[PDB]
Design a protein around this ligand. Structure first.
Ligand SMILES: O=C(O)[C@@H](CCCN1C(=O)N[C@@]2(O[C@H](COP(=O)(O)O)[C@@H](O)[C@H]2O)C1=O)N(O)CO
Ligand SMILES: O=C(O)[C@@H](CCCN1C(=O)N[C@@]2(O[C@H](COP(=O)(O)O)[C@@H](O)[C@H]2O)C1=O)N(O)CO
Ligand SMILES: Nc1nc2c(ncn2[C@@H]2O[C@H](COP(=O)(O)OP(=O)(O)O)[C@@H](O)[C@H]2O)c(=O)[nH]1
Ligand SMILES: Nc1nc2c(ncn2[C@@H]2O[C@H](COP(=O)(O)OP(=O)(O)O)[C@@H](O)[C@H]2O)c(=O)[nH]1
Ligand SMILES: [Mg+2]
Ligand SMILES: [Mg+2]
Lengths: 431, 431
């Protein structure tokens, strides 16, 4: 397929960054369509590690033009910092990065509001990444937020920013009783880069329609995971954007009927960082093993990620919401050495019923217990294996089982962090 | 196609309600996926006029199950009032209406906030429908809003509502200096209907996945229009939800790859109610004619709708954003008697350039001038005509021209408000 979508089927950090970079070899465009700099996508090329947050994962390839779609909430400060670091490493960012004038801006007050609301929550804290993502999306919906296109007229931008910060400071000071954000600093910091950002502006939706008609290859890079979806995730312990396949159209302008293949990134086990329901969560020795062996620490906040067994029930919800075409199984190599591996095949509800569908809101998850299916592990090392013939039978039965429970094939299997430690059984672009 | 989407290609009120009702004869399900009671869809069956707002337009057919998807922001009070009026007219609503537990709730304070923000805007007022739609979507994104699923546990709902209204009253009273909303009235009013609403709850996304596998016919009914889209419309003079095709997936849970045919509702001329850029707007005799002859008054607010010539440039943007499969031209009959009709074929930018694409944000529209293409009108009456052979050549050349400029065929032509005053050249379900 020409238009391929790569997204997380779980709670994020399934290894989307790696897959995007790997598959962009054949793409002309790579587009980010939701989220902001709370995303942390790690790429490892020949041992070199790059961690992108706002900039699309195809930025290291000179043959691809990276595009930050309108769905993304842009932090001018976050962008600059990343652009610089990359430019210092021989990546001519400005030469290959384009962005939407419709992207909402994340400013200093958004971060101030983020930390404030979180402290006001107390024990009910979401455990956000503190990047002001929520407040930015909120200003957008309320129709008072500032967008990239506003930077085109400096005087009116100053007047608009004037109004918005008046409102935001009143609540930060009077209600949340925190520090006011200085209007002049924000105004100065923004204008200092206003021209850099605006020089990269392009009509994304029209461009994507052009690419489509020519039949160019375009890859959509998702941020976060399905269960963090603002509508369908474990509300209110979710992110403020639609992390599901529908976010592709709203966040880039591409018509829904043009999405040809949706690739779901599936980790061999499960992780979640931040508060919220997590049925298969392990609090024992095996949990520590997955964390250590998988080096599960926040690519953005450095927070230790919560680990657990793969949840087939939750994944099936992901298959359905995104109309998945196939999966890419990652971190299979981390499971090496375990005597047994478990797959949650159903949920035991607090009322005794055994269900195979997931609860919606976070509150409806309280009391849910996973119903496992234990399988034999493998002693053989799968790390770096680049062909099925290198995987132990136990590992193969494990792949097959997931396919059986889900009904979706595993087209790609990743056995290590490097771009090459992978095995493509089927290329989505050819599917 | 089994899964058909019906949406407005302009600024709403293109006559979506009529088309949904007409086409639901063959559908098992009809789903609303965005907006709330700001929508006003008029149906006229054998002269009988029904105006729905929150309830799906397939509610008059006993063979269809209406579903209010998670994207919709639900006003418990608005629903009850509509359910009652319909039940009094022999429509067993409760027997055929289902809804999502994920739908955010529109409460009294949301309406209070709506009117307040609008007055604070002054001359920069959006001209909202005052139904609290914006504030409801804002609470959702901020992850502090209450959803239908919250009504399942009355005690915790009271505690949650307690927190949210504390926050909302502080700003309404202290900042906006308006009246506080009484917590007890809202709590009482809500609980009085809490059980009615919860009895209608269904897992929408799972159900739609079931319908899909069986191959049932499902129709998605859009609210508002493309140019009112929160991301891609004339921001900030937009509605707070995604009115484009991508909203179907995020607002119902159906995977993007399952949308088979997107039908764009296209009015013969243009209307817009409320503030915002409108290039082809007429302020002369012909404007008054279109308003009078088309009886252009708000189906929800009673506001006189602004009229103008059909804007081909803006419509082309709609074709692209929604991946339209075909159009349904409505109110052709209103153009009867005009000596000449005009089609805006391109825009004259304030800098002298002639463009064929539309500006994004509302500010980038200031100064834009329409470039017309004049065509001869027709004296013949097309009202009620149910076959192409009843349309005067001039009317036929007009249909053809729109098809030529757009590149999308006109599969349905509506020549009057009644369900039968229509001509289906092609049924989307068979396409
Ligand atoms: O916080 C980190 O360091 C994680 C972020 C994982 C994905 N992820 C987010 O980007 N945000 C998260 O979603 C929730 C809402 O926070 P926010 O509004 O900042 O996105 C939080 O649980 C937050 O942890 C969330 O789970 N990194 O491993 C991402 O590379
Ligand atoms: O206000 C009315 O009476 C119109 C509503 C037309 C569609 N429409 C909306 O539902 N809202 C509108 O979108 C903008 C945002 O308002 P709101 O947040 O209430 O949706 C306003 O211009 C408002 O008029 C808008 O244009 N009716 O003809 C709809 O049946
Ligand atoms: N062991 C192992 N690590 C992997 C594999 N694929 C990716 N990773 C690493 O797993 C982590 C994925 O989390 P993150 O970087 O947040 O990925 P993203 O946010 O989903 O793109 C990164 O540190 C990667 O280097 C794999 O197949 N095996
Ligand atoms: N004259 C005429 N009126 C029509 C036609 N189709 C629909 N209408 C009327 O046009 C109006 C459409 O606006 P509205 O009710 O807001 O429709 P919706 O919001 O798009 O579903 C209604 O009053 C309909 O009865 C048509 O073909 N001809
Ligand atoms: Mg990450
Ligand atoms: Mg209407």
């Amino acid at each position: 397929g020409n238009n391929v979508v790569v997204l997380g089927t779980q709670w994020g950090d399934e290894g989307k960054g790696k897959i995007v970079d790997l598959l962009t070899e054949r793409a002309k465009y790579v587009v980010r369509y939701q989220g902001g700099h709370n995303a942390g996508h790690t790429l490892v090329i020949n041992g070199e590690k790059t961690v992108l947050h706002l900039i699309p994962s195809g930025i290291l390839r000179e043959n691809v033009t990276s595009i930050i779609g309108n769905g993304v909430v842009l932090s001018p400060a976050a962008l600059m910092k990343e652009m610089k670091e990359l430019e210092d490493r021989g990546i001519p960012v400005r030469e290959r990065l384009l962005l939407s004038e419709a992207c909402p801006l994340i400013l200093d007050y958004h971060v101030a509001l983020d930390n404030a609301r979180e402290k006001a929550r107390g024990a009910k804290a979401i455990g956000t990444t503190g990047r002001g993502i929520g407040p930015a999306y909120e200003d957008k919906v309320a129709r008072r937020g500032l967008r990239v296109g506003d930077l085109f007229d400096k005087e009116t931008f100053a007047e608009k920013l004037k109004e918005v910060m008046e409102y935001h400071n009143f609540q930060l000071v009077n209600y949340y009783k925190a520090e006011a954000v200085d209007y002049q600093k924000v105004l100065d910091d923004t204008m200092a880069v206003a021209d850099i950002l605006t020089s990269m502006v392009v009509d994304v939706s029209d461009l994507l329609d052009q690419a489509r008609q020519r039949g160019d290859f375009v890859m959509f890079e998702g941020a976060q995971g399905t269960l963090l979806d603002i509508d369908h995730g474990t509300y209110p312990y979710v992110t403020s954007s639609n992390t599901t396949a529908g976010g592709v159209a709203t966040g880039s302008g591409l018509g829904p009927r043009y999405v040809d293949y949706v690739l779901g990134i599936l980790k061999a086990y499960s992780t979640r960082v931040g508060a919220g329901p997590f049925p298969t969560e392990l609090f024992d020795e095996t949990g520590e093993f997955l964390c250590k062996q998988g080096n599960e620490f926040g690519a953005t906040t450095g927070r230790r990620r919560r680990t657990g067994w793969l949840d087939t029930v939750a994944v099936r919800r992901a298959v359905q919401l995104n109309s998945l075409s196939g999966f890419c199984l990652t971190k299979l190599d981390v499971l090496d050495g375990l005597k047994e591996v478990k797959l949650c095949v159903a949920y035991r509800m607090p009322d005794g019923r055994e269900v195979t569908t997931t609860p919606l809101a976070a509150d409806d998850w309280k009391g849910v217990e996973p119903i496992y299916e234990t399988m034999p592990g493998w002693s053989e090392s799968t790390f770096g294996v680049k062909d099925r013939s290198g995987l132990p039978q136990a590992a193969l039965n494990y792949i097959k089982r997931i396919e059986e429970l889900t009904g979706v094939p595993i087209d790609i299997i990743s056995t290590g962090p490097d771009r090459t430690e992978t095995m493509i059984l089927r290329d989505p672009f050819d599917a």
